[PDB]
Structure formats: structure tokens, C-alpha cells
Scaffold this motif. Sequence first.
Motif: not given
Lengths: 107, 108
Positions: A64, A67, A105, A107, B99-101, B103-104, B106-107
Amino acid sequence: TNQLQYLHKVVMKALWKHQFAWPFRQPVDAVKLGLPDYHKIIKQPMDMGTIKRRLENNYYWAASECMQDFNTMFTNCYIYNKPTDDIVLMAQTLEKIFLQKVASMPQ
Amino acid sequence: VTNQLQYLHKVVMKALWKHQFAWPFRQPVDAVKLGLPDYHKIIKQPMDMGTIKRRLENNYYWAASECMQDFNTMFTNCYIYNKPTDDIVLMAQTLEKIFLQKVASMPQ
Ligand SMILES: Cc1noc2c1-c1sc(C)c(C)c1C(c1ccc(Cl)cc1)=N[C@H]2CC(N)=O
Ligand SMILES: Cc1noc2c1-c1sc(C)c(C)c1C(c1ccc(Cl)cc1)=N[C@H]2CC(N)=O
């Protein structure tokens, strides 16, 4: 991590080679471009060359964080430029690829 | 219904909708209310969390990437339209970080 390796080898790889990537591969050079107000408006400059070097040097602790650097780079473009500037469309295009690739990406 | 869409609804939207800075983003920008006759001239694809939420609730999306694009458009709209010094820019950046944290994680 798996995640940082993905951001490096899949996401950055794809963005880097894009036809619209060239303005984003190195820091904005305010002197060369004649932008005396760039560093007054943009307080955290970011570019893909910086991100790439960070990925190579194991700078990031979490996906993150990387990102977030990508996001800062695109956001700086939208904040600084006129809405009608070509660069804005170029950033939006690249940003949509980034998110599309981020969706897969591991997990 | 996908695992990713359920994640965006239950984790991402949940977190963002109730955030203290969400209130400008919960309904479409009302150009008349705000006195902005150029808004729709500059922003050609308006988007807001109210719309995304309704879309999540009604199984409008086919893929999570599509929902993520809507979130992205909403924030981008804010950065493009507003002046750099505007407080809304900082509110949007705060929400977008969350948001970005999320989605990092997300399955798949
Ligand atoms: C990134 C970024 N954010 O702002 C800017 C940049 C960059 S980096 C770079 C190598 C260039 C040529 C620019 C351009 C630019 C100008 C025209 C076109 Cl087609 C594409 C980019 N624009 C400046 C702003 C300005 N008006 O000079
Ligand atoms: C979203 C979005 N994108 O732009 C705008 C918005 C929205 S929606 C909304 C309900 C409001 C109050 C705004 C604000 C705004 C202005 C001051 C503060 Cl503290 C917070 C938001 N600003 C407009 C732009 C403008 N100059 O009014």
C-alpha cells in the motif's frame, strides 16, 4: 513480499513501457520546463523512476505504501495542470491501467 | 456477486461512507446549489459515493475493477476541478489513501 514483486514486475513493467509513460519516468524538472511555481504547488513530487528505484532497493514495507506513491504521482499531475492539458488525459489513462492491474495483485 | 465486490461493499464502502470527510462525496455534485456553472463543462463523468453504493446494493457491477474505476473517477474529478489549496483536495486525498490501503487487501 509477493505483492511488492507484483507491483514491480507486472504493474510498473506495464506502465513503464506505455506510450504515455515518458513524462512520468523521471522527476518533473521545473527549471528545464520553466515552471517556477511547480515546487510551490506540488509539495511531494513523485515519479515512476523514484518508485522503481524504491522497489529495487527494498524501500517499501507494504504494497500500500508503494500504491500510495503511484497515487501521489497521478494526483500531482491533476492538481498542477489545467483540466484541458493533454498530460491530464495521459495520467488518467495510466491510472486506469494501474488500478486494473492492482485488482489482480496476489494477496 | 463476486468475492471482490462483496469486499468493496463490506470493507471499502463501509469505511469510506462513514468517514468524517465523506460528506461532500455522498451525493452527486449539485452545480446549482454550489453556484458552479462550469462544473459539468469541466467534469464530463460525475461520480459520487451515493451512486457507487447504490450500484453495489443493486448488483450493477460485473467486476470489482469497475467499481474501483468509479471510486477513482470520483477522486480524480475532485483534483481536476478544484484549486490545489482547497480543503476538499485534502479531504479527497485522505479518503483515497484509505481506499488504496483497503484495496491492497482485497481477495485475489
Ligand atoms: C509530469 C508532469 N506534470 O506537469 C508537467 C509534467 C511533465 S514532465 C515532462 C517531461 C513534461 C513535458 C511535462 C508536461 C507535459 C507537457 C505537454 C505534454 Cl503533451 C506532456 C507533458 N507538463 C508539465 C507541466 C507544464 N505545463 O510544463
Ligand atoms: C465533491 C466536490 N468537488 O468540488 C466541490 C465538491 C463539493 S460537493 C459539496 C457538497 C461541497 C460543499 C463541495 C465543495 C466543498 C467546498 C468546501 C468544503 Cl469545506 C468542502 C467541499 N467544493 C465543490 C467545488 C466548489 N468550489 O464548490
